[PDB]
Amino acid sequence: GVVDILKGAAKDIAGHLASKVMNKL
């Protein structure tokens, strides 16, 4: 499930990222 973890892993990073924007609105 490597490929499955590789993609799902990016979700953890974009987590604190996609927050920056959401933090504005």
DSSP-derived 3-state class of residue 17: helix
Pull the structure tokens for residue 9. 């892993």
Residue 1 carries which DSSP code? Answer: -
Into how many domains does the chain fold?
1
Tally the residues of the chain: 25
DSSP-derived 3-state class of residue 21: helix
- Residue type (1 letter), 12: D
Domain span holding position 9: 1-25
